[PDB]
């Protein structure tokens, strides 16, 4: 279906240590494929998925150079932002940048993004037209003018509409055996008395990919929100995901309730009922 | 493949 490539960059200042901690990761869809950690010994961008290992030395030298440059820029930014907010040099602060692109099911460009945050809140972002900026406050307005003068959007736009999308299609093809697979959810139901007069029904979806899935409870074929609970979709550790949805029901009415599961890997949406 | 060579400072 639809696909994305995204890069994430976090830097945390550490007053009393020599330099901020900088951690960068890259994903295609929900799968991690590279990382960099400023504190680790290698000082290289490292492979995290098997299909990226085939890239040759020019690729790895280039990606390591860029991500090292990016650590330096985040380091200067943490100082600039402290100065802009007149903040003490004693505190630890955070900078985050993410960028990337999406393609559709036809694999053509859908949208690109580039966003930045300071201490967990929006600072500046490129808008969807990839020509203009939104700034959170007056500090960010000075940044925005600077980036406008320097034609940052133009260069980001060229990358996101071009290289970002091409290298994504390249990865999708070189990793096709794992990136273009769908693992349909393995599905079952659980039952527990929670009271004398109540029972909980829990509907499980396991080992599915991609992470996107929808789980809903109905009663008499009508959607049920009351006394339900949905957990956050969680990673299994092996490249797949898990989720469940529960409903507490009057005991003896279990058979009125039905769990409904939709996933790309399912030719048709499953319906489950207690045993 | 990342954006490069690098970003302007904020």
């Amino acid at each position: 279906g639809s696909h994305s490539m995204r890069y994430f960059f976090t830097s945390v200042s550490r007053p009393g240590r020599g330099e901020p901690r900088f951690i960068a990761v890259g994903y295609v869809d929900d799968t991690q494929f590279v990382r960099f950690d400023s504190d680790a010994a290698s000082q290289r961008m490292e492979p995290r998925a098997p299909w990226i290992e085939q890239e040759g030395p020019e690729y790895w030298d280039g990606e390591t150079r860029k991500v090292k440059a990016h650590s330096q820029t985040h380091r200067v930014d943490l100082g600039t932002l402290r100065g802009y907010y007149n903040q003490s040099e004693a505190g630890s602060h955070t900078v985050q940048r993410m960028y990337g692109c999406d393609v559709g099911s036809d694999w053509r460009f859908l949208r690109g993004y580039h966003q930045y945050a300071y201490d967990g809140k929006d600072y500046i972002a490129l808008k969807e037209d990839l020509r203009s900026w939104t700034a959170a406050d007056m500090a960010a307005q000075t940044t925005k003018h600077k980036w406008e003068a320097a034609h940052v959007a133009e260069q980001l736009r060229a990358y996101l509409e071009g290289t970002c999308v091409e290298w994504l299609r390249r990865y999708l093809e070189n990793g096709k055996e794992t990136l273009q697979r769908t693992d349909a959810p393995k599905t079952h139901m659980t039952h527990h008395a929670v009271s004398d007069h109540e029972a909980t029904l829990r509907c499980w979806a396991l080992s599915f990919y991609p992470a996107e899935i929808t789980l809903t409870w109905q009663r008499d074929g009508e959607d049920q929100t009351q006394d339900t609970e949905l957990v956050e979709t969680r990673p299994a550790g092996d490249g797949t995901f898990q989720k469940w949805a529960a409903v507490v029901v009057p005991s003896g009415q279990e058979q009125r309730y039905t769990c409904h599961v939709q996933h790309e890997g399912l030719p048709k949406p499953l319906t489950l009922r207690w045993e | 493949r990342q954006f490069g060579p690098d970003f302007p400072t904020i």
Partner: T-cell receptor, first 109, second 118 residues
Framework: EVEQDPGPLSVPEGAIVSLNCTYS??????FMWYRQYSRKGPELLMY????GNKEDGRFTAQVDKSSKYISLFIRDSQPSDSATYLC???????????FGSGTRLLVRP | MDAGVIQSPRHEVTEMGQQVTLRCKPI?????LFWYRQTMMRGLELLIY????????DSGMPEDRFSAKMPNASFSTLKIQPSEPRDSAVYFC??????????????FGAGTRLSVLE
């Protein structure tokens, strides 16, 4: 590796001059020209992203990424244009430039 | 006029075997610094550049005898030890800023002309 003919080129004042470079590596994306006078540093003239045609006064820089061939044209050449002309290029992984070996131009008064 | 990039020494003529030190002060406020050299044999070529004082690309540094440092934003050094006749060249330092580099602008010093003799 970029290939640039050394010349020297000798042309009469008022002539159109054409300089060029060829390259091999398709990762190059940014193309530039410099002038350097005898015993001095290089001076940026003109600079072209990706493809296309770029005019400034008597200068036109051009890039053809299909043919991997870049060129600079100087209209109405002048004695003060007499210099060595170097092309330079890079990709987007680094600010490191690769330069051609230069063409010496003599514009005769 | 604010100063441009300052290099020193302007000229150096020295015997092989010695250490040579080339120095560069970038335009103050600039956060990138480049070292190039130019000879007849290999042309004009990047040795190393720094950003925020850290070496970013040093793929053009000779594999032995050459060392580049930037201890602070105002000062870089390129050292050669022991020097050899083939090190003779003009060495250029340049500095720039992101917004100037996006337009392929950098600011060059006047260079150091180095002859190392047998």
């Amino acid at each position: 590796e970029v290939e640039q003919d050394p010349g020297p080129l000798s042309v009469p004042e008022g002539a159109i001059v054409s300089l060029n470079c060829t390259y091999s590596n398709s990762a190059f994306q940014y193309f530039m020209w410099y002038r350097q006078y005898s015993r001095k540093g290089p001076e940026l003239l003109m600079y072209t992203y990706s493809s296309g045609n770029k005019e400034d006064g008597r200068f036109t820089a051009q890039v053809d990424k299909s043919s991997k061939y870049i060129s600079l044209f100087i209209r109405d050449s002048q004695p003060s244009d007499s210099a060595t002309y170097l092309c330079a290029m890079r990709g987007d992984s680094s600010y490191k430039l690769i330069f051609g070996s230069g063409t010496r131009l003599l514009v005769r008064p | 006029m604010d100063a441009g990039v300052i290099q020193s020494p302007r000229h150096e003529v020295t015997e092989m075997g010695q250490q040579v030190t080339l120095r560069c002060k970038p335009i103050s406020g600039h956060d990138y610094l480049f070292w190039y050299r130019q000879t007849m044999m290999r042309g004009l070529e990047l040795l190393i550049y720094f950003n925020n004082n850290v070496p970013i690309d040093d793929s053009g540094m000779p594999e032995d005898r050459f060392s580049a440092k930037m201890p602070n934003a105002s000062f870089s050094t390129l050292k050669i030890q022991p020097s050899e006749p083939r090190d003779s060249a003009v060495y250029f330092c340049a500095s720039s800023l992101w917004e100037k580099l996006a337009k392929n602008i950098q600011y060059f010093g006047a260079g150091t002309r180095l002859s190392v003799l047998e």
